[PDB]
């Protein structure tokens, strides 16, 4: 399973 | 360790041809198991390995929402980086990100990973402590300040030590018949005369898994690293890999050369020689 979203924008 | 899980994200801008495309693929060791492409007719996380198909509807919908949300977030990130580098809105750029967990042969977390690149160059990476960052330049420093203020490292660490390891162990069990099976390489040496007094000895390794392998030529017990032509390990298309190493030798001196093969699927390293 992938990293939870939302991720922080760069 | 002996196992790992990795997700690879690629976001690519293309001014004049729509919004940035976002692709994500997931792997357990050298086996891909999922994919998502924002350019698909109807974007949705799709299975790429037999053992992942058993996951329920919630699993796939959860994955799809994450990647659909990421599609939007990475477009924002591309706009941000364009600005950090004072770049024109006319060029195409790419953000790449690799992240995942490594487990020891016992099943314990060995280490976590989270690395990003911009246009093929290292941008920012989470350090092994899973708490601090290493920025490549003043632009990445802006991202670093932003992620430190938002406690991003803490969120990545929580994932890497928790969900990442948990799901990896689950996948390893569900696909144990393949993921936990090493296939040794089938080996042989071919001979190709190049001239009257020189011939090419090519050592082959076929049908092996995982991709990790060591192929070397020795002359009188001395390896020929500098004189050996070693091609990049390549996929066969049936989950296995292929690789070969060649050396040009003097006719009649072939028996002074030996090919050595090391692979996880081999109880003991192999030593081959040309057999006329």
């Amino acid at each position: 399973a992938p990293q939870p979203a939302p991720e922080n924008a760069y | 360790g002996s196992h790992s899980m990795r997700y690879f994200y690629t976001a690519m801008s293309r001014p004049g041809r729509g919004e940035p495309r976002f692709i994500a693929v997931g792997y357990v060791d050298d086996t891909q198991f999922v994919r998502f492409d924002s350019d698909a007719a109807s974007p949705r996380t799709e299975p790429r390995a037999p053992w992942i198909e058993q996951e329920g509807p919630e699993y796939w919908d959860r994955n799809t929402q994450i990647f659909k949300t990421n599609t939007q977030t990475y477009r924002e990130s591309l706009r941000n980086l364009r600005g950090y580098y004072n770049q024109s809105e006319a060029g195409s750029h790419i953000i790449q990100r690799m992240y995942g967990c490594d487990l020891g042969p016992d099943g314990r977390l060995l280490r976590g990973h989270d690395q990003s690149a911009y246009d093929g160059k290292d941008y920012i990476a989470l350090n092994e402590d899973l708490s601090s960052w290493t920025a490549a330049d003043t632009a990445a420093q802006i991202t670093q300040r932003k992620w430190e203020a938002a406690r991003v490292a803490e969120q990545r660490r929580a994932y890497l030590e928790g969900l990442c390891v948990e799901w990896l162990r689950r996948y390893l069990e569900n696909g144990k018949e393949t993921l936990q099976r090493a296939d040794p390489p089938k080996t042989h040496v071919t001979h190709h005369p190049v001239s009257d007094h020189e011939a090419t000895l090519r050592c082959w390794a076929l049908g092996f898994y995982p991709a990790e392998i060591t192929l070397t030529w020795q002359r009188d017990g001395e390896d020929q690293t500098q004189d050996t032509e070693l091609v990049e390990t390549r996929p066969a298309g049936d989950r296995t890999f292929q690789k070969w190493a060649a050396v040009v030798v003097p006719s009649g001196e072939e028996q002074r050369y030996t090919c050595h093969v090391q692979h996880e699927g081999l109880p003991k390293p192999l030593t081959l020689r040309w057999e006329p």
């Binding site: - | 690879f8 690629t10 690519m12 692709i23 693929v25 792997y27 891909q32 994919r35 492409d37 790429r48 195409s92 790419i94 790449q96 690799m98 690149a117 246009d119 093929g120 160059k121 290292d122 071919t190 190709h192 090519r202 091609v231 990049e232 390549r234 996929p235 066969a236 298309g237 049936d238 292929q242 070969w244």
Partner: protein, 99 residues
């Protein structure tokens, strides 16, 4: 900057004339990701050709596998045609059953 693709043309299983196999064209080490790859039979583009999902290596360069089923022979010539932003002209790589 940019990186030119490495190209390897080979078969999935050892080549046996008249026996169904798989022709592979592995392109790797390139950047950016846009790339055009065609598998050719006697100079003609093969229609049914699939490819793997885009992924990249530790050095961030990309790699893709293009493949199609095929039956080897002594006469039929196979090759892989690759074009990339780093190439001024499309690169042609012929299949050598011993490579």
């Amino acid at each position: 900057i940019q990186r030119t693709p490495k190209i390897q043309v080979y078969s999935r299983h050892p080549a046996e004339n008249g026996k169904s196999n798989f022709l592979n064209c592995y392109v790797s080490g390139f950047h950016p990701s846009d790339i055009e790859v065609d598998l050719l039979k006697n100079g003609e583009r093969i229609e049914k050709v699939e490819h793997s999902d885009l992924s990249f290596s530790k050095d961030w360069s990309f790699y893709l596998l293009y493949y199609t089923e095929f039956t080897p022979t002594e006469k039929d010539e196979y090759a892989c045609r690759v074009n990339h932003v780093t190439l001024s002209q499309p690169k042609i790589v012929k299949w050598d059953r011993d490579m």
